[PDB]
Symmetry: none
Subunit: 38 residues, 3 copies
């Protein structure tokens, strides 16, 4: 996930949530978004 | 649905069923999935 | 459209939920075509 473009990272966050994928997996995406922002 | 990529069909079915979309729209997706199998 | 990681998570979700077998075959077929058939 560190190698994803910002565009694909954010798109994956929305898609994961919309598809109701595993919540811990969704947390990993959130954590990558937070890492990039900090 | 015939020209949808398999990955857009996968995405569509999860989103449609999780979002409680029209059962007719879900049936269109379910029919195309079965057509492909 | 679906990242490798999203697709694999889709497989885990579909199998967990016991979704229709034709839907599981669709996901499996997309996994294989990406050379992730080793699951």
């Amino acid at each position: 996930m560190r190698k994803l473009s910002d565009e694909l990272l954010i798109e994956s966050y929305f898609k994961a949530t919309e598809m109701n994928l595993n919540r811990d997996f969704i947390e990993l995406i959130e954590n990558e978004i937070k890492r990039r922002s900090l």
